[PDB]
């Protein structure tokens, strides 16, 4: 008399197949790429030109002496 | 009840990936009537084309009294016999969740 089949309690689990967790698509990408890229170029011309100012300063001490 | 999450893992691991797709597309394109004159059985059959199986044209036991479908892929390569096996495991979960509701007590 002690056999298995239970009265209730069932799901089931799915046979489904989906995980569309997107994801900033469709022209939202290529937008964070370009602006941060020119931001790095914007970081230039305030350092290389600044080091160029120090570069003439470095060559200044050479020319002032040597007579 | 906790298995379809594990098959959703390998879907992220292989299906949407490109390199493994690039590792197997258009490889083993055998689709003609010599794909059946060679006497092949299932997958490397019906997933390449010809719909036929021994699972609902020929009974075994109480096996027709459950509901399911059989996968078919598009072309006749390995990647369209690979995608039988993802859907095939998505059928055995249904059948087990259908078989448990229908068992009577009895003898052995």
- Quote the tokens at residue B54: 């021994």
Contact B97 A3 (CB under 8 A): no
* b/e sequence B1-10, b meaning 16+ C-beta within 10 Å: eeebeeeeee
SS (H, E, C) A9-61: CCCCCCCCCCCCCCCCCCCCCCHHHHHHHHHHHHHCCCCHHHHHHHHHHHHHH
The answer to whether A11 faces chain B, any CB pair under 8 Å, is yes
Please tell me what resolution, in angstroms, this structure has: 4.2
Residue among A19, A11, A9 at smallest CA distance from B5: A19
Q: What is the distance in angstroms between the CA of the first residue and the CA of the last residue of chain B?
A: 28
* Best of A14, A18, A19 to mutate (most B CBs within 10 Å, chain B): A14
- The answer to whether the CB of B51 falls within 8 A of the CB of B43 is no
- The answer to whether the CB of B42 falls within 8 A of the CB of B50 is no
Cα–Cα distance, A32 to A47 (Å, whole number): 24
Pick from A3, A5, A17: CB nearest B8:
A17
CA distance B106 to chain A (A): 8
- Quote the tokens at residue B73: 């892929």
Cα–Cα distance, A47 to A53 (Å, whole number): 9
* C-alpha triplet B85, B60, B83: angle, nearest 5°: 10
Written as one string, the DSSP assignment of chain B is --SHHHHHHHIIIIIS-SHHHHHSSS-S---STHHHHT---SSSSTTSS----SSSSS--STTSSS-------SSSSSHHHHHHHHHHHHHHHHHHHHHGGGPPP---
The answer to whether A17 faces chain B, any CB pair under 8 Å, is yes
Confirm whether residue B78 is marked as ligand binding: yes
Residue among A22, A21, A11, A16 at smallest CA distance from B86: A16
Kindly report each contact of residues A47-53 with a partner whose C-beta sits within 8 Å and lies 24 or more positions away, as own/partner: none
SS3 A62: helix
Structural determination approach: cryo-EM
SS3 A34: helix
Tell me which residue has tokens 């570069």: A55
């Amino acid at each position: 008399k002690q056999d298995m089949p239970p009265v209730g309690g069932y799901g089931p689990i799915d046979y489904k197949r989906n995980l569309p967790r997107r994801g900033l698509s469709g022209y939202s990408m290529f937008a964070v790429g370009i602006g941060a890229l020119l931001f790095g170029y914007w970081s230039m011309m305030k350092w290389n030109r600044e080091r160029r100012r120090l570069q003439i300063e470095d060559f200044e001490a050479r020319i002032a002496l040597m007579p | 009840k906790n298995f379809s999450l594990r098959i959703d893992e390998l879907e992220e691991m292989l299906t949407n990936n490109r390199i493994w797709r690039n590792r197997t597309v258009d490889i083993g394109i055998v689709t003609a009537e010599d794909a059946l004159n060679y006497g092949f059985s299932g997958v490397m059959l019906r997933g390449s084309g010809i719909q036929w199986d021994l699972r609902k044209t020929q009974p075994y036991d109480v096996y027709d009294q459950v509901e399911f479908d059989v996968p078919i892929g598009s072309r006749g390569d390995c990647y369209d016999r690979y995608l039988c096996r993802v859907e095939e495991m998505r059928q055995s979960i249904r059948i087990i969740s259908q078989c448990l509701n229908k068992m009577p007590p009895g003898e052995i």
